[PDB]
């Protein structure tokens, strides 16, 4: 009100830097799997409990120490250096399973160039079984064993899951996705060739039309007939399945993937480009706009879901039976398919989604590129060419098994195990380290001499007792709740749980490995070794 201009300027600057594909795709299907309404309140609880203080702590550490995500431990706790390798492995797994969504989006963009939309056509085009063009526009009875045209398209064109009988049967590699991910990695490598993106012109123009396209999509979803059945399910208390059902772990994973803390993306961006420029408020407005964008995306998704439920004459939670990351390209497909300017809106949405995914990927790779250059500033920092291409080839070789015909079987597997418990335990370890093994009063004096004002009492009591105990309880709930993965007409076998546990272990075992390795190089008894590894180093 009184400062609306400064507020809207900061809102523009944060939406040009904070919004990513995560809060648009990972949140809706996760909230739908746990039930609408009964997930929003735990989402805000988890956020306000353990996502804002960690965000501010990571930002302050990056602004003060001015080092990479792995080089912070060289001046705080040299024993806890395995966190860097853990973050690197986590980001490697991400880029192994994160590029699939961008590849699917670019394939949709390429296939959305014809005059007739492929989502509104199932007349023996690629592969169609039990199709239904019009839901209720021609007085047709939607019986069982019926699939939507957009569902059949996603199932038979962008990835041919029918060739694979499950996770245990992986066929060949689809060339239509390989040639797409090749161009994706090529255009990604050309943007991180140098790594100088602070006030670019492309970002300021590409962070404008996403807002208006989201607004017009929300308007079209609101003015859609029979779309009021999804709003009630999205704002339902539903206290019966919130006592001991294990809902907080999904909200924790979502808030850790969307916000940024726990991935090394905040430290790489706080190491530079900002040094005492209105701190303690930038993180707040960033979290606010991120939560608002996530809420708008979830509302649009649930509105389209209620519209499809009213069209199919079924329950809102029964439209997508066991759909995982496939809920985006189905609801949004049926939403765009019911617009006057279908082709233009479709191509604009695909372009903004591709740009958002690219901007999100450029932020993730920056947390690993500039991080390892501090420990090796003479063999890899001066080159800037032999390491970027190397990590690109490494991420491409790791993202080749997900391009199989059964790609949806691998994406759903690398979704809840590669980033579920690993990010949580990394955040817990780093928080308890900076709290106890470094001194909360030391960090308070540091941020005081840096900014000029001490944080409130709510933040000081958090990092010492609230955040560590809560993260430990979240980890205990993760360990005490075996996951139950189930895709479209497929049940994951028993060895899938063991494979997921092994995947979620190699990205965490580096910290104990370095802990055991640190107690060998320094001689003497265990007492002096511990008192030397705990105390920081001096330049």
């Amino acid at each position: 009100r009184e400062t609306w201009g400064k507020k809207v300027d900061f809102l523009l600057s944060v939406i040009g830097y904070a919004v990513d594909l995560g809060n648009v795709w990972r949140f809706p299907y996760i909230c739908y799997q746990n039930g609408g309404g009964a997930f929003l309140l735990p989402y805000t609880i988890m956020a306000i409990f353990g996502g804002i203080p960690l965000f501010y702590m990571e930002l302050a550490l990056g602004q003060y120490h001015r080092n990479g995500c792995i080089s912070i431990w060289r001046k705080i706790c040299p024993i806890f250096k395995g966190i860097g390798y853990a973050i690197c492995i986590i980001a490697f797994y991400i880029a192994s399973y994160y590029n699939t969504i961008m590849a699917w989006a670019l394939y949709y963009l390429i296939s959305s160039f014809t005059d007739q939309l492929p989502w509104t056509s199932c007349k023996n085009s690629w592969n169609t079984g039990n199709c239904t063009n019009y839901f209720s526009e021609d007085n047709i009875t939607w019986t069982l064993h019926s699939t939507s045209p957009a569902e059949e398209f996603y199932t038979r064109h962008v990835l041919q899951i029918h060739r694979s009988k499950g996770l245990q049967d992986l066929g060949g590699i689809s060339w239509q996705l390989a040639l797409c991910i090749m161009l994706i990695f090529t255009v990604i490598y050309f943007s991180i060739w140098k790594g100088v993106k602070t006030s670019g012109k492309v970002v300021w123009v590409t962070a404008t039309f996403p807002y208006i396209i989201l607004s017009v999509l929300l308007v079209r979803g609101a003015t859609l007939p029979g779309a009021w059945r999804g709003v009630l399910f999205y704002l339902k208390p539903n206290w019966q399945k919130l006592l001991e059902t294990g809902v907080w772990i999904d909200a924790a994973a979502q808030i850790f993937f969307s916000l940024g803390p726990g991935f090394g993306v905040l430290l790489a961006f706080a190491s530079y480009n900002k040094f005492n420029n209105n701190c303690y408020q930038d993180a707040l407005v960033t979290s606010v706009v991120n939560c608002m964008t996530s809420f708008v995306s979830g509302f649009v998704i649930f509105t389209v879901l209620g519209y499809m439920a009213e069209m199919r004459n079924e329950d809102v939670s029964e439209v997508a039976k066991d759909a995982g990351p496939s809920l985006l390209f189905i609801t949004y497909a049926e939403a765009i398919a019911n617009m006057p300017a279908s082709t233009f809106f479709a191509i604009i949405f695909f372009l903004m989604l591709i740009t958002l995914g690219l901007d999100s990927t450029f932020a993730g790779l920056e947390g690993v590129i500039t991080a390892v250059l501090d420990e090796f500033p003479h063999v890899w920092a001066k080159r800037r060419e032999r390491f970027v291409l190397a990590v690109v080839i490494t991420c491409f070789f790791g993202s080749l098994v997900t391009l199989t015909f059964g790609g949806a079987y691998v994406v759903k597997l690398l979704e809840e195990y590669a980033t579920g418990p690993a990010v949580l335990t990394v955040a817990l370890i780093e928080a308890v380290a900076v709290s106890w093994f470094y001194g909360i009063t030391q960090f308070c004096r540091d941020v005081k001499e840096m900014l000029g004002f001490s944080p409130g009492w709510f933040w000081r009591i958090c990092w010492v007792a609230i955040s560590p105990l809560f993260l430990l309880f979240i980890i205990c709930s993760f360990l005490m709740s075996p996951p139950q993965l189930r895709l479209f007409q497929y049940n994951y076998p028993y060895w899938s749980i063991i494979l997921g546990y092994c995947i979620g272990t190699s990205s965490f075992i580096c910290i104990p490995t370095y802990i055991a390795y640190r107690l060998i190089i320094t001689p003497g008894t265990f007492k002096e070794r511990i008192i030397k590894s705990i105390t920081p180093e001096t330049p």
Partner: antibody
Amino acid sequence: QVQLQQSGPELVKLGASVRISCKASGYRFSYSWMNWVKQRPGKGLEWIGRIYPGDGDTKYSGKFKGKATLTADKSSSTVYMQLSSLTSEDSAVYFCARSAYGSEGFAMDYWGQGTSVT
Amino acid sequence: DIVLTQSPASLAVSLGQRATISCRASESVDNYGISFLNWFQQKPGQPPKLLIYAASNQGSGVPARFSGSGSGTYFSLNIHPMEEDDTAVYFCQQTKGVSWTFGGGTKVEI
């Protein structure tokens, strides 16, 4: 059972046009294609063009693009094939085959008696 | 346009003997795991009926005497139990894109 009826024998005229109907009933009408093959006397089969009920698309074999058109009708569940510039060698048997239910894409053994123009 | 030619031209009707009919699809390739190719049966004075679809499965109301093999480019037909009631002309038809055509015709007569 799916009975696919057709028209009767007609007469060929130099420069005139005919209209062969194809009334299909038994399954969902506006969900499968309606092919139109051409069987020359003594020779082999020959494709002309397909049509999907619902004004979606209308394909041809490249040669019959300007000599024949396909018009759908979702009311009476009939399919017409209006020819153009009928010549002497254009006297053959025109069947009406119905496509499959999607993925497979084959003739479901629903063929007519054949309206051999003469 | 995807052309389709048949290498055989005429076979001999032999009771209890093998009679193969092959139609090449060099200008084609499997699209989505299923072979876009069918098999018909045109009896003298009878409309062409369905014999074998997708080159692997058996059509509705078709006896087990016919069986199609091959995938990709080459395709063949197994008519090992051929009786005197199988004197017709078999055609091929591919459904890859807008290229729907027919073969030349492979009749049987001894």
